[PDB]
């Protein structure tokens, strides 16, 4: 019915009607970082 990875987590699922398998990729995450200069000179920042 479905597959799993080396970490024993769901990795692919087949559709019962159209018997073809579908991949699963978790929704993107990650931390944010704020690049700033000294407040002595400006208040303009860039983010990554």
């Amino acid at each position: 019915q479905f597959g799993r990875d080396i970490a024993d987590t769901t990795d692919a699922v087949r559709d019962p009607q159209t018997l073809e398998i579908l991949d699963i990729t978790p929704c993107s995450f990650g931390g944010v970082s704020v690049i700033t200069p000294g407040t002595n000179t400006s208040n303009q920042v860039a983010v990554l």
């Binding site: 990875d5 970490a7 990729t25 995450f29």
Partner: protein, 74 residues
Amino acid sequence: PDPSKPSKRSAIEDLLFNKVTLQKFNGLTVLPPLLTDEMIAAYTSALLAGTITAGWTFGAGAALQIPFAMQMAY
């Protein structure tokens, strides 16, 4: 390093990199290193060239090639 690119690494460096043979977990993430390995290879090549050319005048002004046999004799 060989100018016939891609040859930024020497033969031995390529052999080592091949010998070494060089997410989903929700919370776990791997950040990239600040210095790419191209920069590390460039640093190593610069050090090697400096120590092979300048001899005992590596770091100062110099800017001339000391003969290798002289360094070997020293």
